[PDB]
């Protein structure tokens, strides 16, 4: 199963993908919003892990617009831990959503979670 990264800071995208590999999965990454949209497009990843404050275009947006199209399972991973976040990101259309800072295992074990649906 192929994961896309969505995430402007290298070495927290370099961790993630070090745990999806470990794990088996094929990694494509992105690092801006606009990136995720072309990787999106020409990968047509299983799911998307998906960092919220990117350049070009924010992680909200590049929600909102793949959600145009695609029923990808999205999983929001972002530092912004408010209600206001929470909810917003859930009703623009992912399926979950874990804070920053993260636990590699629960990460993990919420991308099973989603890909068993
Ligand atoms: F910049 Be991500 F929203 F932690
Ligand atoms: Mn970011």
């Not at 929600?63 to 999983?75: D, E, F, N």
């Amino acid at each position: 199963k192929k994961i896309l990264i969505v995430d402007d800071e290298k070495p927290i995208s370099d961790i993630i993908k070090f745990n999806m590999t470990k794990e088996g999965y094929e990694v494509v990454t992105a690092f801006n919003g606009r990136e995720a949209l072309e990787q999106f497009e020409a990968e047509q990843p299983d799911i998307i892990i998906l960092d919220l404050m990117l350049p070009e275009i924010d992680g909200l947006e590049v929600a909102k617009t793949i959600r145009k199209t695609s029923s990808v399972p999205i999983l929001m991973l972002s530092a912004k831990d408010s209600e206001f976040d929470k909810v917003i990101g859930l009703e623009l259309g992912a399926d979950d959503y874990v804070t920053k800072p993260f636990s590699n295992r629960e990460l993990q074990a919420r991308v099973k979670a989603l890909l068993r649906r």
